[PDB]
Structure formats: structure tokens, C-alpha cells
């Protein structure tokens, strides 16, 4: 591992602090700008909806990216939540009342389970099973989302091979003839401190490089800064134009 | 199906000369600038590495994407082609010579017996096993590389899910927040007529377009229309901005 403090110009910059990971899959090596911050655990916020959608295609709960989830009908803050998804929207738009449909039907005594084959942050649960990612006691660092993400990738979690499949692509953001980047947001708001989540990967012709950012948000105004700075990283190191 | 000549507007801009065929999944109708241009069917080229990779994995000739198919020393006329690829590079860069050696493996025997399970146009597979998609027998339409790619869509063709779900993922050409291209670019030169393919479909929130394109192409520095082309089309029926 290794530190490289001046990416803390691109979160100055943005009057902003926080922590970039980066991993070279390849070359087996990783890189951050703040070591300790990069091995604080927070709640997963958003983050946690890639596990919970393995989890619930597993066990069969959701049968695969089509199927509809109707919405419940009550009118909430987040206006696209207040419509029909898939698995692709759902993860695309965050939906949280979608996941937590997901982990009351999965019940606490296999999520819990599944979160330890997952080896994921601290495996614990406690809390409510329906919003314990957001409030309850589960805490997971940077560099243990990215990993998770390795294992994803390499599909060695103890899922179905189509679970971690079909997640990948609902983790699909963006793609061009340079790259491709799988990554799901967060914002963890209910306890402080208040911090806003990007992890992922950015797929390359010849490499992969795992990324996991987290910064402090005050206000979810600032929320586009998590890729805007991710970027300014990837940048500068290269590794996309 | 409709016609729109309205199309063939951004057909003259560029003097070239094609179809674009588009196939609306929601709402299960069809939309063409040429009628019968849309039905006449060509050597497939490039856009064969779609069934070609499907019946490579579905029958274990390539174990995954990430398996490394080694150069095989020759330095051809295509910088791209002269290294190691895996499925999803291969496709990238329409690696020729990885793609007739999945065919040599495959046989003729199987491949003719997938093509007929896949009404892959007109299912004939005459001329030399490694090359009969570049200048033997096999001719497909527009209109059927569009079933052909909806039932890849759905996972209804007669191979794996897996095998469907790991040549969609190869497919990926481009993604953003409002849509994901899926698509294979093919370039017909070996037997007039010459001409070059872009088939594959856009995938939106609430809904999918398939889309196949074929057009006159004398040299190859027009290539770039392929995409050009269709995407003038797509953007004047407000598929994608």
C-alpha cells in the first residue's frame, strides 16, 4: 500500500475531505490518500444494495433483472422512487423501499449468515432488519469494500455465479471505448458523521482497478463531487482520459 | 411495420446509402427507412461473433470472459489483432483469426445444428467452417438480426443463460445515465455487395429498441457512419438524447 497525499488537492479544490482507494488488480498494489481513513468503517448506506441484491437473488426473492416491483403507492421525498422498477432501476435510482421489501423478506437470521460468507465489514446486523445498512450497526471500510468487490468480480462470493452476474450488470454507470465502470452510490445520513459513498470498479482492456470513495457530505448538494473527485484520481493517475 | 423515408434524409447528408431498422419492445412495432432493404439479407461478417461466441461458451470452447486466447505469432494487417485477447476485447476489436479458431473447435457438425436452433437467417453455413460468415453461404436481413437479438434479450435461445448473459455482457458498447448500447459492428467486404452492419439494441429506463443497420460501404473510411447513422435516427425519435 501505498499513500499519495496529493490527491487531497482535488478534495481541496472542492472545499471537501475525504478518502480515495484505489487497487491495481494486476499488479496486486494499492493506493490511497489518507491510510487511516482509507480502514475507517461507516455505514454502507447505498453501497449496501449491491450484497442485499445478491443476497435476494440467491435466495430466489428476486427472480432476475425484469422482474417488475410494484411501487407501494405512497408518495416519497425521492421522486423517482414513486414508480414501478426492476433490479437495474432500483439500483440505478437507489431505491431504497425496493431493498427493503428485499430484507424483510430475506429475514434476519439469513441475512446475517449471508453477511458473514461475504465476509462483509463488521457482518453485523443488528438493528431493524428493513434499515440496519442505514441506522443499525453495520460499519465497512474502504478498503474492505474494495474486497468485497474483488470477490464480486471474480464471482468467489458464496453466491449462485448468476447472482453475481446479473448484480455486475445492474452496477453497469457508464461505458465507452476506454473503460467501463461498475459502481453503486451511497449516502449514509442518519448517524453521523454524514458521508456520501462511490465504489466499484473501472473495467480496462488489459487491468482492473478497483476504486472505493468516501467523503464527508454535509448536504446532499455536494453529492456529484463523489464522482467528480473519483475521476479527478482516475485522472490523474491515468487511468482513464 | 412502418416505413419512414424520413430517415433516409440522414442517409443523403453523408451519401451513403443503407437501412436502419428499429424495433420498438413495449409497444411490439417496427420501424424501418426501407421496407425491402430491411429484408434483404447479407454475409453477416463481424456481427456473426454474436451466435459464434454464444456456441463457443455454450459448448465449453471458451471456459469464460476472462480466458486469455494467446496471439498466435502471425502479424496481421490490424495492430489490435497482434496480442493476447480475452472474449471481451476479441469482440471489441472484431478480432478475426480468435473467432475462426472458436469455428474450427466448434466444427461445422454443431455449428450448422446451432444456426438452425438459432433461425439464424437462412442457416447455411456452406463454405469453409473458419470463414463461411466473411464469403460462404450464410445470409441474414436486418429484420432477422432483430428476432435473432431479441431472443438473446430474453434468454430465449437454445444455449445457457449463462452463455446469453456472458455475450451480452461482451456486447457492451456504450452506457450513461440514459441509456446502454449493446451492439456488434460487421464489415462485409470479401463478396459484393460491400457493406457494413451495427447491430445490437438500447436499453432505456422503461423500455429496449432493438436496432440493425446495414449500408453501402465502398471503403472503410466511412465506417464511422454505421454508428453515425443510427444514432441521427435514434435521436430524432427521441430514443436517446
Not at 427472480?63 to 414501478?84: C, L, M, P, S, Y
Amino acid at each position: 500500500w501505498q499513500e499519495n497525499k496529493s490527491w487531497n488537492a482535488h478534495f481541496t479544490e472542492h472545499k471537501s475531505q475525504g478518502v480515495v482507494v484505489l487497487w491495481n488488480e494486476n499488479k496486486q498494489q494499492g493506493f490511497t490518500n489518507n491510510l487511516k481513513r482509507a480502514n475507517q468503517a461507516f455505514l454502507p448506506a447505498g453501497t449496501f444494495k449491491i450484497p442485499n441484491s445478491l443476497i435476494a437473488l440467491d435466495l430466489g426473492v428476486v427472480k432476475d433483472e425484469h422482474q417488475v416491483f410494484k411501487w407501494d403507492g405512497q408518495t416519497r421525498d425521492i421522486a423517482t422512487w414513486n414508480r414501478d422498477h426492476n433490479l437495474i432501476t432500483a439500483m440505478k435510482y437507489s431505491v431504497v423501499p425496493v431493498y427493503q421489501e428485499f430484507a424483510r423478506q430475506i429475514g434476519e437470521a439469513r441475512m446475517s449468515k449471508m453477511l458473514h460468507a461475504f465476509d462483509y465489514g463488521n457482518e453485523d446486523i443488528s438493528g431493524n432488519v428493513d434499515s440496519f445498512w442505514l441506522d443499525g450497526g453495520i460499519r465497512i471500510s474502504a478498503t474492505e469494500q474494495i474486497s468485497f468487490l474483488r470477490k464480486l468480480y471474480h464471482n468467489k462470493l458464496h453466491v449462485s455465479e448468476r447472482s453475481q452476474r446479473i448484480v455486475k450488470q445492474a452496477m453497469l454507470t457508464e461505458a465507452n471505448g476506454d473503460y467501463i465502470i461498475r459502481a453503486k452510490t451511497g449516502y449514509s445520513t442518519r448517524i453521523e458523521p454524514k458521508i456520501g459513498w462511490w465504489v466499484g470498479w473501472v473495467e480496462l482492456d488489459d487491468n482492473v482497478w478497483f476504486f472505493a470513495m468516501n467523503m464527508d457530505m454535509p448536504t446532499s448538494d455536494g453529492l456529484g463531487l463523489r464522482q467528480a473527485i473519483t475521476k479527478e484520481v482516475l485522472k490523474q493517475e491515468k487511468i482513464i482520459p
